[PDB]
Design an enzyme around this catalytic site. Structure first.
Site, PDB file in Angstrom:
ATOM      1  N   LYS A 287       2.437   3.419  -5.818  1.00 51.18           N
ATOM      2  CA  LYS A 287       1.889   2.349  -6.630  1.00 51.18           C
ATOM      3  C   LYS A 287       2.916   1.832  -7.657  1.00 51.18           C
ATOM      4  CE  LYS A 287      -1.298   3.295  -3.920  1.00 51.18           C
ATOM      5  NZ  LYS A 287      -1.125   2.604  -2.616  1.00 51.18           N
TER       6      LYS A 287
ATOM      7  N   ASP B 282      -3.436  -3.126  -2.222  1.00 52.15           N
ATOM      8  CA  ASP B 282      -4.465  -2.086  -2.255  1.00 52.15           C
ATOM      9  C   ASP B 282      -4.417  -1.302  -3.578  1.00 52.15           C
ATOM     10  OD1 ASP B 282      -6.615  -0.636  -1.227  1.00 52.15           O
ATOM     11  OD2 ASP B 282      -5.343   0.906  -0.286  1.00 52.15           O
ATOM     12  N   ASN B 283      -5.559  -0.703  -3.932  1.00 51.77           N
ATOM     13  CA  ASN B 283      -5.628   0.316  -4.967  1.00 51.77           C
ATOM     14  C   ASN B 283      -5.327  -0.205  -6.350  1.00 51.77           C
ATOM     15  OD1 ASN B 283      -4.046   2.108  -2.436  1.00 51.77           O
ATOM     16  ND2 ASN B 283      -6.100   2.560  -3.154  1.00 51.77           N
TER      17      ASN B 283
ATOM     18  N   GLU C  22     -11.639   4.171  -0.236  1.00 48.51           N
ATOM     19  CA  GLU C  22     -11.918   4.640   1.098  1.00 48.51           C
ATOM     20  C   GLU C  22     -12.768   5.910   1.088  1.00 48.51           C
ATOM     21  OE1 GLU C  22      -8.797   3.785  -0.143  1.00 48.51           O
ATOM     22  OE2 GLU C  22      -7.274   5.277   0.359  1.00 48.51           O
TER      23      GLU C  22
ATOM     24  N   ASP D 270       0.826  -1.214   0.000  1.00 45.43           N
ATOM     25  CA  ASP D 270       0.000   0.000   0.000  1.00 45.43           C
ATOM     26  C   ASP D 270       0.857   1.260   0.000  1.00 45.43           C
ATOM     27  OD1 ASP D 270      -2.485   1.436   0.078  1.00 45.43           O
ATOM     28  OD2 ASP D 270      -2.502   1.340   2.311  1.00 45.43           O
TER      29      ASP D 270
END
Ligand SMILES: CCCNc1ncnc2c1ncn2[C@@H]1O[C@H](/C=C/CNC(=O)c2cc(-c3ccc(F)cc3)cc(O)c2O)[C@H](C)[C@H]1O
Ligand SMILES: [Cl-]
Ligand SMILES: [Cl-]
Ligand SMILES: [Mg+2]
Length: 213
Positions: free
Chosen positions: A142, A167-168, A197, A139
């Site tokens: 990226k 994540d993401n 989120e 996380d």
């Protein structure tokens, strides 16, 4: 005075020491009602919780702590004796994360390392007496998910069955990592669609289980 500091202060003003759920709820409230922040959040957090409970990892590595929300989330679900290592390059965030975990009463289960993943990863075996990791939560920036995954493999920290959770993978996205793990015979991948989120924007987590060389 920074957003991250204001989040910590809100938690200290509002939540209960030693109660991880109260800490997570305070953060979610602050970020919904006052100022958005890039914590994994409750929607994806619930998926994280379900994954952690399923695999019961003994040793988890987190890349990118930010304010410690995901560290609190994971550490609260660890079995007695299991541990989380989290790496955070920004000194201010590392301090906020340590204080967040202290407040939650989880400090005994977590080691917060203030440094760059690419510098710390190669030290884990010798300096931190790690053999292999059971789970890795990605996380951080990226564009570093793929370079760090490849580095973890090079350093012998992945075993057959190591669970990567990223994540993401939709927003902001991590296109090189996602294409790589989905195309590789060394990973078995599953996508968990969710929401960014504190927002009505689709995002998701990718689970990529290492299959060995
Ligand atoms: C090169 C050093 C690498 N090694 C490193 N080693 C150790 N620690 C590292 C390393 N690289 C970075 N870190 C730390 O990880 C954290 C950084 C996390 C980054 N996260 C995002 O950018 C994001 C954006 C959005 C978002 C979505 C929608 C929007 F509109 C806006 C934003 C949502 C999200 O859920 C997101 O997680 C922390 C701030 C930073 O110091
Ligand atoms: Cl987080
Ligand atoms: Cl949320
Ligand atoms: Mg994130």
């Amino acid at each position: 005075d920074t957003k991250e500091q204001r989040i910590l202060r809100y938690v200290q003003q509002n939540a209960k020491p030693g109660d991880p759920q109260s800490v997570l709820e305070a953060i979610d409230t602050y970020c919904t009602q006052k100022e958005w922040a890039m914590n994994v959040g409750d929607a994806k957090g619930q998926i994280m919780d379900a994954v952690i409970r399923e695999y019961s990892p003994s040793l988890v590595l987190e890349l990118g702590a930010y304010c410690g929300y995901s560290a609190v989330r994971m550490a609260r679900l660890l079995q007695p004796g299991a541990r989380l290592l989290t790496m955070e390059i920004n000194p201010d965030c590392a301090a906020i994360t340590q204080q967040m975990l202290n407040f939650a009463g989880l400090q005994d289960k977590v080691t917060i390392l203030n440094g760059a993943s690419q510098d710390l990863i190669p030290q884990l075996k010798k300096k931190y007496d790690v053999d292999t990791l059971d789970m890795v939560f990605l996380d951080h920036w990226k564009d570093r998910y793929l370079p760090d995954t490849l580095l973890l493999e090079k350093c012998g920290l992945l075993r057959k069955g190591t669970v990567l959770l990223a994540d993401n993978v939709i927003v902001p996205g991590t296109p090189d990592f996602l294409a790589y793990v989905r195309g590789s015979s060394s990973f078995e991948c599953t996508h968990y669609s969710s929401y960014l989120e504190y927002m009505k924007v689709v995002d998701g987590l990718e689970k990529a289980i290492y299959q060995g060389p």
